[model samples]
Target chain A: TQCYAEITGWGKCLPPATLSNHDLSTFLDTSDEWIQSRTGIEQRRISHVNTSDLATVAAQHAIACAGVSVEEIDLIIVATCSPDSLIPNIASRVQQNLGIPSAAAFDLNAACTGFLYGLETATRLMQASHYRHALVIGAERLSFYLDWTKRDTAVLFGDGAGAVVLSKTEQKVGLQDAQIGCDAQGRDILAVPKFGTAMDRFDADNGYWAFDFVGKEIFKRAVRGMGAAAQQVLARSGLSTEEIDVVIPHQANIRIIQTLCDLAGIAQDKAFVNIHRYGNTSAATVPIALCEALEQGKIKPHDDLLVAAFGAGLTWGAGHIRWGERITPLGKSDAQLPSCDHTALDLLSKAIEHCKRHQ
Target chain B: TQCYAEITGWGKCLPPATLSNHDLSTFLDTSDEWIQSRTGIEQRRISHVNTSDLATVAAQHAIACAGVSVEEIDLIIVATCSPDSLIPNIASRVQQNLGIPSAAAFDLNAACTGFLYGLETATRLMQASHYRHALVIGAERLSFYLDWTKRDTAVLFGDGAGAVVLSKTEQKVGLQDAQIGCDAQGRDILAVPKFGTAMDRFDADNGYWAFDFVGKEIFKRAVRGMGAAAQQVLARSGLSTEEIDVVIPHQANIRIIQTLCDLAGIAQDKAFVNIHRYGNTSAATVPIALCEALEQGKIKPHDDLLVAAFGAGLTWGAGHIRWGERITPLGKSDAQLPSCDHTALDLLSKAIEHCKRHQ
Candidate 1:
């Protein structure tokens, strides 16, 4: 009756093209120092492929790490704000690409916090006895929709994907305790508007691609929601803040991360920070952070992990996870994205030119 | 440890604008008899509002029927492929409109089978002990993108929403058994592509809104998937087809429904259907069917019910639900959509004229 959710495998995919702050300054009204000082992001990955391509690679790696056959997987959830397609969902694309004959695959949206939400969801579904192994991937090609002319969003978002495999066993620690919540009062403070049916389909409203950001308000809410949720999860797990071996938070901004750590009484070093490398990949952040932490050997057997996330929908959640034995991967996948031939500046300029066509 | 995911209340929303087979003949090259004989659809609703508006109305009605305040909701899931917005998700809009002060909200896409998927998800999450009540709604405004000039795809879909409130209580019957799966080989046979990141952002495709469907393949696959999943769930629930009191299959085509029941050993009359009233609303089909079944007094206390669904993504699922002690609502909500002043033809004509601009 306790937690039997085991994280048997983990993997991540960072597109080959890297977009630095300097690259964004090539067109936008911002410099590298200005972007870095405020957001703590130096560079981020720019995808050469669609969102599903990134997810397939990451999922391949995760399945391999779990040392399981593709047929053994019964469920797949691709949590993303930037889905490759909304019709059949990118999950089916991954399933088709991976050649898995059967599984329940779908896409979920909780924006940046989606990975944590997916993990909690997969864990719970597996416990229902129908699902044996679940491949939960937080994959996003946020750059596909970012208006390159806007520095605020353009500099903050990147394209990447991360995946984790959860297996339901008789006795193995997984997500021991977790709390997910939404404060809708702040839902409109930060978002990308007009992405779905909200747009006037008759006119297909202009600027649907625009990213609306009230950064000051988002910062305050992010800290409050992430910190409060983290504390609640800690209390629910019967563990203190100091007992958390690692704090893998949604890597939105460095300041938000730092402030969350300070307010939650978590050690700065204990929290994993990779915003400088990937900026904010929305749903892909936390899972990628988990992969990095494990690869860097920061996670150990019996280590307690506190994961907190905050995103659009004003969605926020926290989970207390316990690592089982085997920090090393059972195997690795050679799955790779198609090679990129264009520079970040070239890609950014072309995208900007395309945006100007309709403007 | 037994199923405690009790559905205490349910509601549905159908926009006032009704598009009928006779009306369809004004523009399309088909007669009412031909359309009716093939698809078994006589009419479908056309929403003046977006998908989120439909969901908000349905959710308000559900919460009222459950006799609970919005504050009691800890989870809200909107299962839809045609969401109003993708950035924050349509679920957050529902939460904000309902003024739910705190909750976890997100959008899930499994096409027409989404309600069953959402039900399974909400029921499992409630058992995690962190959630007290969940508002799971399946809503869609698929007509927003349908090509009015193409009757093949246009005639088979409508706009509608349905919601149910699940309360995690002790000793209450909920979803006793369920199974969900996807077969990706036929993903391309039925779909609406270019609605997501998969499209070339540089040059948005001209026919992104067009629906690509191979009806013959879809019919064969749908029956196979729905029938097999229903059989598997039946076996798992330790019940035979004869013991099922009611069958709520996705109202796709009358033929598909007939084929599924025949292959699964279910009686034709035992299956509740309203396809003539509302075509296929994709994700909204099953839940809306459930609402109508209860409203018409087809469902009863302790009734062993079977729900089966198949949709785009080639996603399919089956659920065996045990009815609780109540068959009637404890209360009703006066939640209504903003009144529509236009006829179905008037709305359809404008959307068509708008499409002609880009063409």
Candidate 2:
């Protein structure tokens, strides 16, 4: 007998503070109109908490939504590039925060495409009977690595977390097909230059460690890579783009999402767009968008959903999910991130001051 | 027909520079006899290159040993806590270096238990039919974060990498039964505090961020965790400890390894010991030891092998593998890491000077 991995629950934790493009204009040379028209981002969340804090809250909600006790979650996989520390992984922190006493936890990184990569990995682990229930979270605090003075990349990232609870079922309703790919040739197009061990940390200043985002090239490659991966996933699943009722993609940019739909022959209306609410949150993009899509009733029972994403490492992937009969929560949790004492602008003030000193 | 993930090839890349306990005596108060009798580590490798460099060489050799072309690799999983960067990911860098044009790449971290974690992940992915072949490499450069003045933690780590190629097969071999578990409560017992995103990178100093290694706590937990996990794997596989032909545990403390064997009711001779040569390479310990065990002709075809590991995150896991019909490499590659220009003493001199300046 074999078991299939099913998405039993989902949840997301977006920070309370929202930073609009107008807020950025106060610090940079960008305006709301120019930013919205270019990236389709109106405002993004700014977190008072770290990535693991957000992930823990989201995981709490997901565990409740699944109607499962914490003891049932035997595996916890947190996919993030902006983990708090490298030694004690983000997943372990989540485990500690959630009091998940005995689950195997680890952190995985594929940048913005991390959610898709994590989904495939988690679903397979369930299928192989490694664990009956696995909690997979995609969380990131990209704001930590941003140079607030640089409008190009700084304005494009936000902080948030989203998660799903996957359980083993005899039904065939989860991760029907997936196509994950990487073209390291484009790895240099997007990176954090001084963020890793490769750099000299002692002399490394946060001002110089800003994101190296090659906007034009990344735009082109993201579209092509995501489109191709989507098509392959559709082909493998024996479903056409037209059969996909909803397209949940990495909410990096509005233009890129639209372009991806067009290239994949998917109807523009089928693609859910939520970048306006939260800018690119790196690994958190897809799962947060998926949660939003569910909340907005963009997804329905038995819907053929296509998820596509692309990010650093030039990692790109698409997965075909056969949505199950359940979309509503079976239970709810009162877990919440600590209330922010400051607004988005106030949060940016510290980073802004640091950037000024370095500049 | 169900598919099994079989180990087709194995290889390792130990940096040429060797750091001896005598060298530690040059600066720290630790003696050679005290170090060896205490931790069973006389010497260990010190890499001039980064984590990715070691991973790439090991990967190249594994690909060659598998007698498969690079194009056959559809997935690359680099398990490491000491990755070069969190953004580009070590797996993608290895892909780029090896010219693996199209392979899904990501980095997985479970600290020293990373190889066991990577093995379970890769094997499950193959069973789910996501990819035909996977290149899983466990690599780390702990030297980069070491505080040279702290003999307790500094003398216990080395830099190196090891890899294995897992391919889809119909035979009943590879990862027969496994149990992976983590206890977040022990996360603080072993950690490099300042290396991750949790710290303020701009003002972060590696000299100030030395390892917080609780030797007594780790020694106790390592034995209990690995021993229990191994017992679970054995029970699940319906194999008794006496039936196990060879035991390849994490190359951590020799005392811990022997204790684990005793707890599991296994003879000391049944365990393969290698910490004497490499101290603790963290994630690279298991795979490097696996490769050496094979080279020494200890692991034979049709043998029942038991592998277990424990690391930070307080992560611990064990796997029972039924050795396949073949144990020798079909082909080999001469891929080599660039020569090191400095000796172990020379490398430590700079780090020593930096620590002195900070103090």
DockQ per candidate: 0.70, 0.68
Return the TM-score for each candidate structure: 0.97, 0.98
Which parts of model 1 have CA positions greater than 4 angstroms off? A1-3, A202-208, A356-359, B1-3, B202-209, B354-359
| lDDT of candidates 1 onward, in order | 0.87, 0.87
* Candidate 2: stretches off by over 4 Å: A204-207, B204-207
State in Å the error of residue B284, model 1. 0.6
Query: What is the C-alpha lDDT profile of model 2 across B122-202, one tens digit per residue?
Result: 998999866899999999988878887687888899999999998899999988888998999888888876667667645
True contacts kept of each: 0.78, 0.66
Worst 10 residues of 1 chain B by lDDT: B199-208
Model 1 scores a TM of: 0.97
